[PDB]
Each structure stands twice: as structure tokens, then as C-alpha cells.
């Protein structure tokens, strides 16, 4: 029976059409029909959602064995420092958004989020997600304080969507240790500004 779950694909070998994946609880699954994937060069740290099913063979040095279904790509990025100049509140924006489930994998390499907001659902508006640290008594010193932003490009908020985007923690991976998690700005869909603390798992 088919399986469902997000990971990185890890692409490390020198062919890279060879790839496994990881689990965020820091397991490994390695994918029996990769070579079918052969004309997708997937990038190593890439995030997606995998259809899979579990063979009951074992592979030596990874956790699961399995026949891929398919591979549907999460939006993966990195964080927007304050030196970025790109880092602009025009080209940043701060449309609303609902962070609707957040979470850290094992390793505190990504902070995966569960979002909605309204669009009008065409391939012709294009959305921006980023997560940003900004250029400008708070727990600074046990949460590492990011702004989790949308530009929506002036696309008409007609009907409710959701989606994953997963950023890439190691700009800040010197700042996580000795620290309890990330406070998570966001100018939610219906209540104003929220700070979200996500812990390390």
C-alpha cells in the first residue's frame, strides 16, 4: 500500500542522477527506481513530497527500501539576511498569511511551514514566501527572531489555498546552538500580528 511523506533529497554521490532521501525524524529512504527520475536533476537539499512504496528488502546504510510513485517538489529557500539586497520591504512584502502548522527537523536543518492565504489560483500570478531576519524585554536570547513574509503582487484575494514552503536553516545554524527554537513573525490571514515559537526538536 502507498506511503506519503516530506523529506531532502540528498544528492552527494558524483553522478547525480543518484539520490536517497531524508526523513525529518533523520531516517533514510533508499529509492530502488531513482535512475527513472534520471531526466529531473534534483539539487542536493531539494525538499518533496514522496509517493512510495515500501519494499520489504532491506538496503545496507538506509532505514527504508522503497519504489518511488512519484515526486512532487516542495518550494525549498534559503533565509533572507539583513546584508541581502534583495531584503527591501517592496520586494519583501508583507501581505497576510496564515501559518497553519510548523516544525523543525532533527538535524535543524529546515523550518518546514503549512501556510494559506487568498489568490486568485493562476500560474500567471506568482506569490513570494520568505523568511526573513530584519534590517532595522524580548527572548532574542532563547529564540532566534525571523519574519516568515508574503508578497502576494497585487493578486486579488479571492479564494483560500494552502502549501508548504521549507527554508533552509543554515544561515542562523551559528545562533542555534544554546538556543530554544525560532520566534516566527507573521501578519496572520484575520488576527493581526502573531510571534510563533517553533522549537528544535
Request: proline residues 4%; glycine residues 8%.
Given at each position: 500500500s502507498r506511503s506519503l511523506v516530506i523529506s531532502t533529497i540528498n544528492q552527494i554521490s558524483e553522478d547525480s542522477k543518484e539520490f536517497y532521501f531524508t526523513l525529518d525524524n533523520g531516517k533514510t529512504m533508499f529509492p530502488s527506481?531513482?535512475?527513472?527520475?534520471?531526466?529531473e536533476k534534483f539539487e542536493n537539499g531539494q525538499r518533496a513530497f514522496v509517493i512510495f512504496n515500501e519494499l520489504e528488502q532491506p538496503v545496507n546504510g538506509y532505514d527504508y527500501n522503497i519504489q518511488v510513485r512519484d515526486i512532487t517538489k516542495v518550494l525549498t529557500k534559503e533565509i533572507v539576511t539583513?546584508?541581502?539586497?534583495?531584503?527591501?520591504e517592496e520586494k519583501i512584502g508583507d501581505d497576510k498569511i496564515n501559518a497553519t502548522y510548523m516544525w523543525i527537523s532533527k538535524d535543524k536543518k529546515y523550518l518546514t511551514i503549512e501556510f494559506q492565504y487568498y489568490s486568485?489560483?493562476?500560474?500567471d500570478k506568482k506569490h513570494f514566501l520568505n523568511l526573513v531576519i530584519n534590517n532595522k524585554d524580548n527572548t532574542d536570547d532563547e529564540y532566534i527572531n525571523l519574519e516568515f513574509r508574503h508578497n502576494?503582487?497585487?493578486?486579488?484575494?479571492?479564494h483560500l489555498g494552502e502549501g508548504y514552503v521549507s527554508f533552509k536553516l543554515d544561515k542562523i545554524e551559528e545562533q542555534i546552538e544554546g538556543k530554544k527554537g525560532l520566534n516566527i513573525r507573521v501578519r496572520t490571514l484575520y488576527d493581526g500580528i502573531k510571534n510563533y515559537k517553533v522549537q528544535f526538536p
Open positions: 527506481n531513482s535512475q527513472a527520475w534520471g531526466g539583513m546584508d541581502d539586497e534583495e531584503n527591501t486568485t489560483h493562476s500560474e502576494s503582487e497585487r493578486d486579488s484575494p479571492d
